[PDB]
Symmetry: C3
Subunit: 101 residues, 3 copies
């Protein structure tokens, strides 16, 4: 399985998109939480509140999920980061596989 | 070292279990924080607040830790996810090894 | 690219340090959020609120970033954890490379 991380400018867009990803069976679950982001907005250091999303899905759904997120994401250049899971309890993996495409 | 991620239905269960894991020297530290979880509860998309736990421990304590979490966790099928750390500052690794089993 | 995780005793130190890392172009962005930490303070289980920092930067900036964090961090033994990213959307990687050293 993999974890996929992306961030959204607000809760409205984060919830709309992850509900869509769940409806499309592209992810088994999403964990959303606020964070304060600091980055260069091409020119100057900017700070603002965003909603971080931790998505859990199958390894083989990565490319489709990545494409779908590009299509639905409010940002023109969103972050879509893949972290492979080295091991996981089997019953949970079974549940995740069953819940996804 | 590894990071192990699991989630709990509430703060009471998350704190009880991680304190137990620390008492048993199965982890060096735990970081707990709330998130909003969205997932299929087998049938329909559900939303609810949960407590995410980031556990830091030794690579060789993975299997024992995974088993202990299954035993203590309120969920019948909890998520117990292992992410290997590619590198870390040595003094911190030394502290983590000393604090664990 | 890599994710680098570290934690701070408070928001004042976390923001001061990540702004410095951005000014020095050692990271492309930082996501900060509070968590409750539980650990052995060498002797007894302690609990306290801390600020977790998720830093995103280039793979080849790891050693310099790790050294800089040791120098700036309020803790004498901070956690500086490196997690390699297995894949990421190309346009985001391009932005991250351009924003860093």
């Amino acid at each position: 399985m993999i974890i996929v991380y992306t961030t959204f400018p607000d809760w409205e867009s984060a919830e709309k998109v992850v509900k869509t990803l769940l409806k499309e069976r592209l992810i088994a679950c999403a964990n959303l939480r606020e964070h304060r982001a600091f980055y260069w907005w091409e020119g100057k250091i900017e700070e603002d509140k965003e909603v971080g999303a931790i998505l859990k899905t199958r390894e083989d759904l990565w490319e489709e999920l990545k494409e779908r997120i590009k299509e639905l994401h409010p940002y023109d250049v969103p972050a879509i980061i893949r972290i492979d899971v080295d091991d996981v309890n089997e019953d949970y993996l079974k549940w995740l596989i069953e819940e996804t495409k």
